[PDB]
Structure 1
Amino acid sequence: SGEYTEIALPFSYDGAGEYYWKTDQFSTDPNDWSRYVNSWNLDLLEINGTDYTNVWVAQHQIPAASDGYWYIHYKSGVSWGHVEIK
């Protein structure tokens, strides 16, 4: 199903583009405040089919998928659009 490319942390992309990636590397640990995630310029950002583009989130806040992965969607909107996943 889909087209999920595998990505390793810390990761980043830039410029407008629609994408879908997968990772097995989120920290589960509530003291790992340095392993956080943020965006704003992106038009749409989702984990496992549910949106988080409006906010920051910590990797230890995000529940895993049915197989134990995290799957991450991204979308085009602006030519200077940045992101980073810690």
Structure 2
Amino acid sequence: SGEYTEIALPFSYDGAGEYYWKTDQFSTDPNDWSRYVNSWNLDLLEINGTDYTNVWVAQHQIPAASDGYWYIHYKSGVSWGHVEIK
């Protein structure tokens, strides 16, 4: 449980802390491999209930929640936590 802040894509962030971001802008096209989520140096990156910590994954591989959103929960313990969402 976290209070989510809405974000726009493309998105990038590099930093420490624990954040709850939501968007309705992910790619839903199975043909697309340009619009990815990528991260490293994270303790957690979970999106809609699935662990995507420290991986490259195409957005189309991640279904929307029933409400049409993608709920992204980020945790980094270091300065250099990294996430990119195209």
CA RMSD, Structure 1 to Structure 2 (Å): 1.4
Structure 1 alignment gaps of length 5 or more: none
Q: Deviations over 1:20-48 (max 9, x none)?
A: 01000111112221111111211111012
Distance in 2 separating the partners of 1:43 and 1:49:
15
TM-score in terms of structure 2 length: 0.89
Post-superposition offset of 1:50: 2.5
Q: Deviations over 1:30-86 (max 9, x none)?
A: 222111111121111101232110421111110111111110000022112221111
| Other structure's SS at 1:18 match | strand
Distance in 1 separating the partners of 2:68 and 2:82:
27
| Other structure's SS at 1:60 match | helix
How many pairs are equivalent? Answer: 86
Runs of 4+ in 1 over 6 A off after TM superposition: none
| Other structure's SS at 1:39 match | strand
TM-score in terms of structure 1 length: 0.89
More strand by share: 2
Identity of aligned residues (%): 100
